[PDB]
Short mmCIF file of C-alpha atoms and ligand atoms in Angstrom, two decimals:
data_model
loop_
_atom_site.label_atom_id
_atom_site.label_comp_id
_atom_site.label_asym_id
_atom_site.label_seq_id
_atom_site.Cartn_x
_atom_site.Cartn_y
_atom_site.Cartn_z
CA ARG D 4 73.67 122.39 76.25
CA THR D 5 77.45 122.64 75.91
CA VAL D 6 79.29 119.14 76.10
CA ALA D 7 82.90 119.90 76.69
CA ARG D 8 84.72 116.87 75.26
CA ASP D 9 88.34 118.33 75.10
CA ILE D 10 90.79 116.62 76.86
CA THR D 11 94.49 118.25 77.49
CA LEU D 12 96.87 115.40 77.34
CA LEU D 13 99.69 116.82 79.35
CA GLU D 14 102.26 113.92 80.02
CA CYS D 15 102.87 110.49 78.62
CA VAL D 16 103.04 107.94 81.56
CA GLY D 17 103.51 104.49 79.45
CA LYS D 18 104.31 103.72 76.00
CA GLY D 19 104.18 99.90 74.48
CA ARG D 20 103.08 97.97 71.97
CA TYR D 21 99.33 98.39 73.09
CA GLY D 22 99.69 102.31 72.12
CA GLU D 23 100.33 104.97 74.65
CA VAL D 24 98.67 106.15 78.29
CA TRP D 25 98.51 109.65 79.06
CA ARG D 26 97.86 112.15 82.09
CA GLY D 27 94.84 114.27 80.76
CA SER D 28 92.93 117.04 81.89
CA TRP D 29 89.25 117.58 81.80
CA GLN D 30 87.30 120.61 83.43
CA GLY D 31 90.32 121.08 85.80
CA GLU D 32 90.66 117.45 86.73
CA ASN D 33 93.16 114.55 86.21
CA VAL D 34 92.14 111.50 83.68
CA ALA D 35 94.04 108.74 82.13
CA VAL D 36 93.70 108.56 78.56
CA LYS D 37 94.81 105.20 76.90
CA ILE D 38 95.33 105.51 73.13
CA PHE D 39 95.03 102.48 71.18
CA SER D 40 97.74 101.29 68.78
CA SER D 41 96.08 99.59 65.26
CA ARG D 42 97.80 96.32 66.50
CA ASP D 43 95.55 96.47 69.97
CA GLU D 44 92.34 97.99 68.79
CA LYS D 45 90.00 94.49 69.78
CA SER D 46 91.20 95.37 73.55
CA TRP D 47 89.39 98.52 73.11
CA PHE D 48 86.43 97.09 71.54
CA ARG D 49 86.24 94.33 74.16
CA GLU D 50 86.71 96.56 77.15
CA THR D 51 84.00 98.86 75.56
CA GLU D 52 81.44 96.03 74.85
CA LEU D 53 81.88 94.82 78.78
CA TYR D 54 81.22 98.38 79.82
CA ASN D 55 78.40 98.64 77.48
CA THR D 56 76.89 95.18 79.10
CA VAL D 57 77.93 96.31 82.66
CA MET D 58 78.83 99.47 84.27
CA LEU D 59 81.25 97.97 86.71
CA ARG D 60 81.94 100.73 89.77
CA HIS D 61 84.11 98.99 92.52
CA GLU D 62 86.62 100.58 94.62
CA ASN D 63 89.17 98.05 93.38
CA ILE D 64 88.44 98.30 89.81
CA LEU D 65 90.07 101.25 87.53
CA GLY D 66 87.12 103.79 87.19
CA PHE D 67 85.81 104.06 83.80
CA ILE D 68 84.94 107.57 82.46
CA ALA D 69 84.49 106.91 78.65
CA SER D 70 85.17 105.26 75.31
CA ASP D 71 85.63 107.44 72.23
CA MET D 72 86.08 106.74 68.43
CA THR D 73 87.14 109.71 66.50
CA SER D 74 87.12 109.52 62.76
CA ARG D 75 90.55 110.84 61.13
CA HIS D 76 91.64 111.44 57.35
CA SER D 77 92.51 107.86 56.88
CA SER D 78 92.38 105.95 60.38
CA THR D 79 90.19 105.63 63.25
CA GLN D 80 91.42 106.92 66.60
CA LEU D 81 90.44 104.84 69.78
CA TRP D 82 90.71 106.18 73.40
CA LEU D 83 89.61 104.76 76.73
CA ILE D 84 89.23 107.28 79.76
CA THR D 85 89.53 106.32 83.00
CA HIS D 86 90.32 107.66 86.56
CA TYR D 87 93.92 108.75 86.82
CA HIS D 88 95.82 107.25 89.91
CA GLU D 89 99.40 109.29 90.03
CA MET D 90 101.25 106.80 92.09
CA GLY D 91 101.20 104.47 88.79
CA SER D 92 101.31 100.60 88.80
CA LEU D 93 101.96 98.10 91.45
CA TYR D 94 104.85 97.06 89.24
CA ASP D 95 106.33 100.62 89.41
CA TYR D 96 105.90 101.19 93.22
CA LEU D 97 107.50 97.94 94.26
CA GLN D 98 110.67 98.76 92.41
CA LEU D 99 111.98 101.25 95.07
CA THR D 100 109.23 101.41 97.99
CA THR D 101 109.23 98.68 101.03
CA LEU D 102 106.14 97.29 103.06
CA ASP D 103 105.07 96.74 106.35
CA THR D 104 102.88 94.32 107.69
CA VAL D 105 99.67 96.72 107.45
CA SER D 106 100.29 97.94 103.69
CA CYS D 107 101.37 94.47 102.41
CA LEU D 108 97.95 93.02 103.86
CA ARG D 109 96.10 96.48 102.65
CA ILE D 110 97.56 95.78 99.14
CA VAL D 111 96.83 92.21 98.63
CA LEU D 112 93.10 92.36 100.48
CA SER D 113 92.41 95.27 97.98
CA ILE D 114 93.43 93.16 94.82
CA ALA D 115 91.45 89.77 96.34
CA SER D 116 88.41 92.24 96.68
CA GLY D 117 88.55 93.64 93.04
CA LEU D 118 89.25 90.20 91.87
CA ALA D 119 86.42 88.51 93.43
CA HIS D 120 83.99 91.36 92.32
CA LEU D 121 85.00 90.85 88.85
CA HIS D 122 84.65 86.82 89.42
CA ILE D 123 80.91 86.77 91.11
CA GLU D 124 77.76 86.99 89.43
CA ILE D 125 75.18 88.96 90.85
CA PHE D 126 71.70 88.37 90.02
CA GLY D 127 68.87 90.95 89.43
CA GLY D 130 73.60 92.81 89.15
CA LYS D 131 76.61 91.72 86.76
CA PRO D 132 77.71 88.80 84.84
CA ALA D 133 80.63 86.86 86.07
CA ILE D 134 83.86 88.16 84.52
CA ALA D 135 87.32 86.69 84.36
CA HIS D 136 90.53 89.06 83.43
CA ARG D 137 92.87 86.84 81.77
CA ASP D 138 95.98 89.21 82.10
CA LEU D 139 96.20 89.71 85.87
CA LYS D 140 99.82 90.96 86.53
CA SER D 141 101.53 93.70 88.77
CA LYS D 142 101.66 96.17 85.57
CA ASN D 143 97.56 95.91 85.43
CA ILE D 144 97.48 96.73 88.79
CA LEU D 145 97.04 100.53 90.00
CA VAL D 146 98.15 102.20 93.57
CA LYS D 147 95.68 104.51 95.34
CA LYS D 148 96.75 107.49 97.60
CA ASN D 149 94.59 105.64 100.60
CA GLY D 150 96.91 102.38 100.35
CA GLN D 151 94.57 100.01 98.52
CA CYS D 152 94.95 98.86 94.53
CA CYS D 153 92.77 98.87 91.66
CA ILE D 154 92.44 96.15 88.99
CA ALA D 155 92.88 97.85 85.19
CA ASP D 156 92.72 96.59 81.53
CA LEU D 157 89.69 94.26 80.49
CA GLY D 158 90.82 94.27 77.19
CA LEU D 159 91.14 90.26 77.32
CA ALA D 160 88.18 89.69 79.93
CA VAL D 161 85.56 87.15 79.15
CA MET D 162 81.74 87.33 80.73
CA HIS D 163 79.45 84.74 81.75
CA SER D 164 75.79 84.70 82.49
CA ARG D 177 95.85 89.38 72.28
CA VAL D 178 96.69 86.15 74.86
CA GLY D 179 97.90 86.72 78.29
CA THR D 180 101.10 87.58 79.38
CA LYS D 181 103.32 84.46 79.37
CA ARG D 182 105.46 84.77 82.47
CA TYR D 183 102.20 84.60 84.22
CA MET D 184 100.35 81.83 82.24
CA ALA D 185 98.80 79.09 84.05
CA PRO D 186 100.14 75.42 83.41
CA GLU D 187 96.91 74.69 81.65
CA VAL D 188 97.35 77.46 79.46
CA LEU D 189 100.86 76.52 78.62
CA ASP D 190 100.01 72.98 77.68
CA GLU D 191 96.94 73.74 76.07
CA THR D 192 94.76 71.38 78.24
CA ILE D 193 92.67 74.48 79.78
CA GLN D 194 88.79 73.46 79.14
CA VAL D 195 88.05 76.37 76.95
CA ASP D 196 84.09 75.84 77.08
CA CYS D 197 84.14 75.88 81.23
CA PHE D 198 83.90 79.49 82.64
CA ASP D 199 85.55 78.26 85.90
CA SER D 200 88.71 77.53 83.86
CA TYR D 201 89.45 81.23 83.70
CA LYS D 202 88.72 82.01 87.06
CA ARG D 203 91.47 79.35 88.00
CA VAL D 204 94.13 80.89 85.65
CA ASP D 205 93.17 84.35 87.26
CA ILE D 206 93.95 82.77 90.69
CA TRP D 207 97.49 81.31 89.51
CA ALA D 208 98.17 84.91 88.11
CA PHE D 209 97.13 86.40 91.49
CA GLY D 210 99.21 83.95 93.93
CA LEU D 211 102.33 85.45 91.49
CA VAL D 212 101.34 89.10 92.37
CA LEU D 213 100.93 88.07 96.04
CA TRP D 214 104.67 86.58 95.82
CA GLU D 215 105.98 89.80 93.81
CA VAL D 216 104.09 91.92 96.90
CA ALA D 217 105.42 89.76 99.79
CA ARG D 218 108.99 89.73 98.66
CA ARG D 219 109.00 93.61 99.29
CA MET D 220 107.43 93.51 102.85
CA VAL D 221 110.31 93.87 105.81
CA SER D 222 110.79 91.05 108.87
CA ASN D 223 113.17 91.22 111.06
CA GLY D 224 115.29 94.03 109.11
CA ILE D 225 115.45 91.52 105.93
CA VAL D 226 113.45 92.28 102.60
CA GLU D 227 114.25 90.88 99.21
CA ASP D 228 115.11 92.99 96.14
CA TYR D 229 112.00 93.70 93.51
CA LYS D 230 112.08 90.57 91.13
CA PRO D 231 109.24 89.53 88.55
CA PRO D 232 108.09 86.09 88.80
CA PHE D 233 110.47 83.08 87.33
CA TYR D 234 113.43 85.73 87.28
CA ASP D 235 115.72 83.15 88.18
CA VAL D 236 114.77 80.29 85.63
CA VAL D 237 113.43 82.33 82.25
CA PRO D 238 114.88 85.05 80.08
CA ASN D 239 113.42 88.43 79.79
CA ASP D 240 110.65 88.03 77.18
CA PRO D 241 110.38 84.26 77.91
CA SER D 242 109.17 82.29 75.01
CA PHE D 243 105.83 80.29 75.55
CA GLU D 244 108.23 76.91 75.35
CA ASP D 245 110.40 78.59 77.89
CA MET D 246 107.66 79.15 80.30
CA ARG D 247 105.98 75.49 79.50
CA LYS D 248 109.26 73.81 80.35
CA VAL D 249 109.65 75.34 83.90
CA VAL D 250 105.93 75.64 84.96
CA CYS D 251 104.47 72.40 83.21
CA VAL D 252 107.66 69.79 82.57
CA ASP D 253 109.55 70.94 85.70
CA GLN D 254 106.60 72.02 87.61
CA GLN D 255 108.82 74.91 89.35
CA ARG D 256 107.08 77.31 91.43
CA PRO D 257 108.70 80.82 92.93
CA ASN D 258 111.15 80.28 95.88
CA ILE D 259 109.86 80.73 99.41
CA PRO D 260 112.85 82.38 101.35
CA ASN D 261 113.44 81.15 104.83
CA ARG D 262 113.39 84.37 106.43
CA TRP D 263 109.21 84.53 105.60
CA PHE D 264 109.27 81.36 108.18
CA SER D 265 110.18 83.75 110.95
CA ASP D 266 107.18 86.07 110.41
CA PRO D 267 103.67 85.10 111.01
CA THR D 268 102.20 87.29 108.20
CA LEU D 269 104.77 85.76 105.46
CA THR D 270 104.32 82.24 106.76
CA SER D 271 100.30 82.78 106.34
CA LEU D 272 100.93 84.48 102.84
CA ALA D 273 103.48 81.63 101.60
CA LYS D 274 100.71 79.23 102.29
CA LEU D 275 98.31 81.12 100.68
CA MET D 276 100.43 81.44 97.41
CA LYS D 277 100.91 77.54 97.25
CA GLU D 278 97.05 76.94 97.31
CA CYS D 279 97.02 79.21 94.04
CA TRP D 280 99.79 77.24 92.38
CA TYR D 281 98.36 73.66 92.30
CA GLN D 282 98.90 72.20 88.96
CA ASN D 283 95.20 70.80 89.31
CA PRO D 284 93.10 74.23 88.62
CA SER D 285 90.23 72.97 90.51
CA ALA D 286 92.50 72.48 93.85
CA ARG D 287 93.07 76.20 93.95
CA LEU D 288 91.41 78.66 96.33
CA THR D 289 88.80 80.89 95.31
CA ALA D 290 89.16 84.48 95.32
CA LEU D 291 86.15 84.58 98.15
CA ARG D 292 88.16 82.24 100.43
CA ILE D 293 91.45 84.20 99.42
CA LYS D 294 89.60 86.93 100.94
CA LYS D 295 88.24 85.50 103.96
CA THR D 296 91.85 84.17 104.60
CA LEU D 297 93.52 87.46 104.50
CA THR D 298 90.73 89.01 106.56
CA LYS D 299 92.26 86.16 109.60
CA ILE D 300 95.86 87.33 109.28
CA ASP D 301 96.99 89.58 111.68
C1 LIG Z 401 80.13 112.91 73.95
O1 LIG Z 401 81.47 112.55 74.43
C2 LIG Z 401 81.92 113.08 75.52
C3 LIG Z 401 80.94 113.77 76.53
C4 LIG Z 401 81.22 114.16 77.82
C5 LIG Z 401 80.25 114.84 78.53
C6 LIG Z 401 80.59 116.26 78.83
N1 LIG Z 401 79.53 117.04 79.39
C7 LIG Z 401 78.35 116.24 79.68
C8 LIG Z 401 78.05 115.29 79.22
C9 LIG Z 401 76.79 114.77 79.78
C10 LIG Z 401 76.34 113.81 80.52
C11 LIG Z 401 75.08 113.40 80.80
C12 LIG Z 401 74.26 113.94 80.36
C13 LIG Z 401 72.66 113.59 80.67
C14 LIG Z 401 71.95 114.05 81.42
C15 LIG Z 401 70.44 113.81 81.95
N2 LIG Z 401 69.72 113.51 80.76
C16 LIG Z 401 68.32 112.87 81.42
C17 LIG Z 401 70.38 112.36 79.97
C18 LIG Z 401 71.66 112.94 79.44
C19 LIG Z 401 74.06 115.19 79.54
C20 LIG Z 401 75.66 115.13 79.30
C21 LIG Z 401 78.85 114.27 78.72
C22 LIG Z 401 78.77 113.04 78.52
C23 LIG Z 401 82.54 114.04 77.99
C24 LIG Z 401 83.53 113.50 77.38
O2 LIG Z 401 84.94 113.23 77.90
C25 LIG Z 401 85.36 113.22 79.34
C26 LIG Z 401 83.04 112.86 76.16
O3 LIG Z 401 84.06 112.54 75.27
C27 LIG Z 401 84.51 110.98 75.59
C1 LIG Z 402 81.48 111.04 81.65
O1 LIG Z 402 82.24 111.43 83.16
C2 LIG Z 402 81.57 112.65 83.76
C3 LIG Z 402 80.36 113.03 83.25
C4 LIG Z 402 79.67 114.12 84.10
C5 LIG Z 402 78.50 114.71 83.76
C6 LIG Z 402 78.39 115.94 83.02
N1 LIG Z 402 77.16 116.44 83.12
C7 LIG Z 402 76.30 115.91 83.48
C8 LIG Z 402 76.35 115.06 84.18
C9 LIG Z 402 74.98 113.87 84.48
C10 LIG Z 402 73.50 114.64 84.86
C11 LIG Z 402 72.67 114.34 85.09
C12 LIG Z 402 72.43 112.90 85.13
C13 LIG Z 402 71.00 112.30 85.42
C14 LIG Z 402 70.75 110.85 85.19
C15 LIG Z 402 69.22 110.17 85.27
N2 LIG Z 402 68.79 110.96 86.22
C16 LIG Z 402 67.84 112.45 85.71
C17 LIG Z 402 69.41 111.79 87.39
C18 LIG Z 402 70.90 112.53 86.77
C19 LIG Z 402 73.33 111.88 84.35
C20 LIG Z 402 74.91 112.54 84.16
C21 LIG Z 402 77.43 114.12 84.34
C22 LIG Z 402 77.66 112.78 85.04
C23 LIG Z 402 80.65 114.66 85.17
C24 LIG Z 402 81.81 114.00 85.65
O2 LIG Z 402 82.68 114.60 86.58
C25 LIG Z 402 82.31 115.51 87.14
C26 LIG Z 402 82.34 112.89 84.89
O3 LIG Z 402 83.56 112.43 84.91
C27 LIG Z 402 84.74 112.61 84.61
C1 LIG Z 403 97.49 99.21 83.33
O1 LIG Z 403 96.34 99.77 82.25
C2 LIG Z 403 95.90 101.24 82.31
C3 LIG Z 403 96.94 102.17 83.29
C4 LIG Z 403 96.19 103.47 83.29
C5 LIG Z 403 96.66 104.31 84.27
C6 LIG Z 403 95.94 105.18 85.41
N1 LIG Z 403 96.40 105.84 86.28
C7 LIG Z 403 97.37 106.34 86.44
C8 LIG Z 403 98.47 105.64 85.36
C9 LIG Z 403 99.92 106.15 85.70
C10 LIG Z 403 100.30 107.36 86.00
C11 LIG Z 403 101.69 107.91 86.37
C12 LIG Z 403 102.62 106.97 86.22
C13 LIG Z 403 104.15 107.62 86.19
C14 LIG Z 403 104.43 108.97 86.17
C15 LIG Z 403 105.00 109.68 87.40
N2 LIG Z 403 106.07 109.06 88.05
C16 LIG Z 403 107.31 109.26 87.64
C17 LIG Z 403 105.72 107.63 87.99
C18 LIG Z 403 104.30 107.26 87.71
C19 LIG Z 403 102.21 105.66 85.66
C20 LIG Z 403 101.18 105.45 85.53
C21 LIG Z 403 98.06 104.79 84.29
C22 LIG Z 403 99.08 104.18 83.49
C23 LIG Z 403 95.18 103.73 82.37
C24 LIG Z 403 94.73 102.94 81.67
O2 LIG Z 403 93.77 103.10 80.51
C25 LIG Z 403 93.22 104.72 80.30
C26 LIG Z 403 95.22 101.63 81.45
O3 LIG Z 403 94.85 100.67 80.41
C27 LIG Z 403 93.54 100.12 81.04
#
């Protein structure tokens, strides 16, 4: 039989220290192609090892298609091929788009659903998985209004470091219990709470909305250092601002409470992804 492997690379949709992401075409269909830098080869190996262990399939997880290694004259070329989401990342989407109650809840409940799916061990099934770099750039928006979680290059399984702006206090103060898988779930819940803040700001109530800002925009520089983050999060124990206008809206009042239960200094006090889902299903 003929095994069609040609992918036409059409448009670069992302370039960074990680490498590049391209919109590509296989057999008439859009795919996304991540081409890894030499600097980030271990992220390709980790995501490939995970998908060789468990073929994750969930509506709120970016859909895997292929991992390809190709021999070149003097180098190895590493590609990850996934489903393509033309609306782009949640980070991108929130820059100009505002939300209503239904769209805001649908976004955040879809993220919580993908995250609970990663976290929960299924017997017979899948190992428990923690993501370790959850943020709005690692979430894609689908045409149906739900999102999906991307980038398992730092993921850990149980049966590069995270983006510093989103690091939990125990990562910044190096107290994290590294031999305990639950520690890594609790670092993802902290980062989830920051994403929930970023999205809620863009939900309109009584004619008011906040501009898009990243977490801690008002207290750290761009590309904040590890020390900049530690002083804010660990020493001063700052948390993102909840605007007064949220307390006139029942949805944003409930979301403020939720985000505050993702941000406890004590990791074991934070809500679980399953409890976040249940709370979101009871809002509105
Ligand atoms: C090697 O590389 C790539 C391959 C492909 C691809 C292209 N056509 C057909 C296939 C195919 C799938 C599955 C079977 C099965 C049939 C049932 N039988 C019992 C076991 C075998 C055969 C063939 C593949 C996997 C796409 C690629 O990119 C999108 C590849 O590059 C990453
Ligand atoms: C990698 O990705 C894509 C792959 C393909 C594709 C191409 N040839 C053959 C297949 C295939 C056929 C048959 C089985 C068998 C498995 C065992 N048993 C006997 C029942 C069924 C498995 C695989 C596929 C899945 C199509 C795709 O899209 C249309 C892909 O997505 C981009
Ligand atoms: C986060 O990480 C990964 C993401 C993706 C990925 C999947 N679908 C779509 C995208 C995308 C498409 C289009 C735009 C732009 C271009 C047009 N318009 C002006 C604004 C929107 C942005 C983004 C990406 C980047 C793939 C990955 O791997 C193959 C990723 O890494 C795991």
